[PDB]
Amino acid sequence: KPAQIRFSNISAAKAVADAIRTSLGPKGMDKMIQDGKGDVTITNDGATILKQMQVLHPAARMLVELSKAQDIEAGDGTTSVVIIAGSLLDSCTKLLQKGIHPTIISESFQKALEKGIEILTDMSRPVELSDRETLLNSATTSLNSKVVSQYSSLLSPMSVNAVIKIVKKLGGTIDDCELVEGLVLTQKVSNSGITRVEKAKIGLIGCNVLLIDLALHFLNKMKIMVIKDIEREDIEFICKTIGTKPVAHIDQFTADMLGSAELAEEVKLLKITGCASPGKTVTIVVRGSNKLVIEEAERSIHDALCVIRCLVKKRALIAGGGAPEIELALRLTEYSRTLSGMESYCVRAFADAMEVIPSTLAENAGLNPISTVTELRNRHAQGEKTAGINVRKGGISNILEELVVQPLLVSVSALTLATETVRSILKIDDVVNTR
């Protein structure tokens, strides 16, 4: 009886989405997680929820990686990928009761995934990548839903003119930023006494700027800037910026392992401009008062670059709040009417899986879960994806007029990594432990 394992992988993956679904959207519900040390935490970010779940079942272990895969490809809608895969398997149980094979469902979803991107292409609005005004509106609109939403209008353009490392220290404020063509470090030049060097040559351990008690004194006699205490993350960036290479031996120190720089001084950060080497690099100087503010400031720009990366691959924009999802659930129902075999009943179940996203956002928005999605189906049938769910006001409104936009890559990648992962579960007959 191979149904004993296919039924368990579904219920195991179903329990993960049934929990985290309440944290969907900005107006989602928080959670109360108890850690092994005894303390607890209050956070709604889904990336931290599943990371602390410590799952054991293989079906649920794939959902943790499913969320991490979206974080690298698109970077937005991390929780939306687990909810779709959770709702798809919920519909698959209705199919297995009918006597359908799992492999038949896999190739049927290949057609739904093929027609799934098509529905988003006709509704999406292409845009120009070179137009920075569209890059600023597309970036600043989505940035309002982040934690630091008040200082989003000033952190967005710093990612525009840079397109990339982000330096941050305490003191100052968020509004002030500066783009460095070269590189900047979070270290100091102690215990050197010069602190200002023109005609600099850099070589990672002739060389005037050393990026690593008797050695502190002898290195000062020749007037050589000594900079030590550098972690490995900076070694990968300085090599591509100025063209340096590591020197692991004193005899290996030669002219072929050095660099060059028109200016390398500590204005306490090490502003080193004038790379004068072939490459593509930039460093953004960020300031802030508290430590919790600068950490969120990095995520503000780092999440902003995910939207810039989404516009480069997919030069198109789509409505938010589940607006294009209604068109995806309606048009696939019509395509199934012309199909035959076991593909029609499977494409229909694939559309019902997407109906829960706006129903869940309707729940987290306080509206009725049914009257919200049922009214949008006709608004999209007769209209388009302009109308949708507006969570800021708590009602149905024109999402394009409400200044809410997301790129085409976010919704596309959320469905590809989700459907492909469900097919991996359908291709599992049983699991055995080894040693």
Added chain:
Amino acid sequence: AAKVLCELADLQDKEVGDGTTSVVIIAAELLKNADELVKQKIHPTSVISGYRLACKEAVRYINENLIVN
């Protein structure tokens, strides 16, 4: 759920420094009634937005009944 009320008075102790006990009683009785709304098929989201506006107008009606030095 109890430690939320511990940090509730700590922030009130630094800025104002008095009446921190009455702050815990107001929030304590609000959740007794808010849970009754959930028992009457009311989502907590609609209760949050209603409480924020009830707090918005509460400051206004106070300002309309102030007295000067």
Added chain:
Amino acid sequence: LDLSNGKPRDNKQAGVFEPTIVKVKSLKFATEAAITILRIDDLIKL
């Protein structure tokens, strides 16, 4: 209300005044904390 006698009392003539920053910030902090406790909608135990 006269707390010493248990009756109504005109505070303008009796002089039972209070600052503005007390009653205003108390209602904000009490409402904001109750929203936090009610925003919680899950329970996970490791």
